[PDB]
Symmetry: D2
Subunit: 117 residues, 4 copies
């Protein structure tokens, strides 16, 4: 299905398989903060999106808690990827690790847990 | 006052003062996910903006780690507010709590820590 | 009321009520790390205990994700308290905030979420 | 020597640049009311590896840590905390610590420090 928010940010799904996903995007001018780098929310949205698709492969679920650790800033024009991998799958919950990468560099690390419906 | 990303999302600054900030927004059609509710990326972007604004009132700061806990889903039309308050202020770091509220209900809770440049 | 690990650490229950709890303890010689201050694991154990006690007032539950933000170091002798309050209560999950306080100073901030059985 | 690690009976199995492994056994004084390993015990194990790993880069103080619980452990269970560096910057560093018991991922810990 088409995700309005994902489309609004211009995010693309490069890979989607059981328990994993890769979403890509480009930092545009409308994604910057006052400092001129990619807004923390744009990077998080990229990761959150991969996280969402990967967990949906396991069935309907709702995110509970997510953590985002920022390591490197990205400037406008930067191409970035969110790579989601399943860390734990239980009957009622699941956790995923999402690496935000740009040109071989680990830009940020995302951890998210969902509640399986 | 707002940055390019906040502008793209329709987020507005309602208040800013030392150690705190209030940002408001409304859930629009382009903020929804596959399932029709506010995309987690939107809610986080709102909280992250209040977090960033409040943290910078103490001087240039860069985000290190953030946590987002989701409690209630929101649909199109929902008016939402992110309220940031300073929890701890040290010479090199600071932590903020950001409550995301809609119609008197706590929608999500955000905690963020910055490195003070 | 008290826990076997709480007992081993010398932690005591000062207060319990619906959705809340207060646990108290003192930093002993066996709670310090190589550098002479309270070990991060001790402060977390303290907060985690108050968290576990508060959530169980709503029924049995199992912890899913917890965050611990450290603000101030504590030395041997310090009287400390973990104060847990309910932030969100849903049918299947609940989240709590736990403030670790010592002599009126916020030493650490803990956030924890559980799955209700 | 770490007094708290000693008190919990934690042992350092490996220490190298930016990494560490700490081991321990769930004893009767490490349980919760449910009869399983107290969340605080599992965390102390991970936090210990985290601390040892980060301090190989220089004196540092923990800022924020996350602990995700996946499986419960019973008394007598042998557990390990394996710390690896995920990011190293001039002022901060982040580590991933896996808590393992009998080949199973019991918990995942993420921690960031401020390098003094
Ligand atoms: Cl977290």
């Amino acid at each position: 299905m088409r995700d309005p928010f994902m489309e609004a940010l211009g995010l693309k799904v490069l890979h989607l398989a059981p328990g994993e996903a890769v979403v890509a995007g480009e930092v545009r001018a409308d994604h910057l903060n006052l400092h001129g780098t990619a807004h923390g929310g744009f990077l998080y949205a990229l990761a959150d999106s991969a996280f969402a698709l990967a967990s949906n492969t396991r069935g309907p679920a709702v995110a509970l808690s997510c953590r985002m650790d920022y390591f490197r800033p990205l400037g406008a024009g930067a191409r970035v990827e969110a790579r989601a991998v399943e860390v734990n799958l239980s009957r009622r919950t699941a956790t995923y690790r999402v690496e935000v990468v740009s040109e071989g560099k680990l830009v940020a690390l995302f951890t998210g847990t969902v509640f399986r419906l």
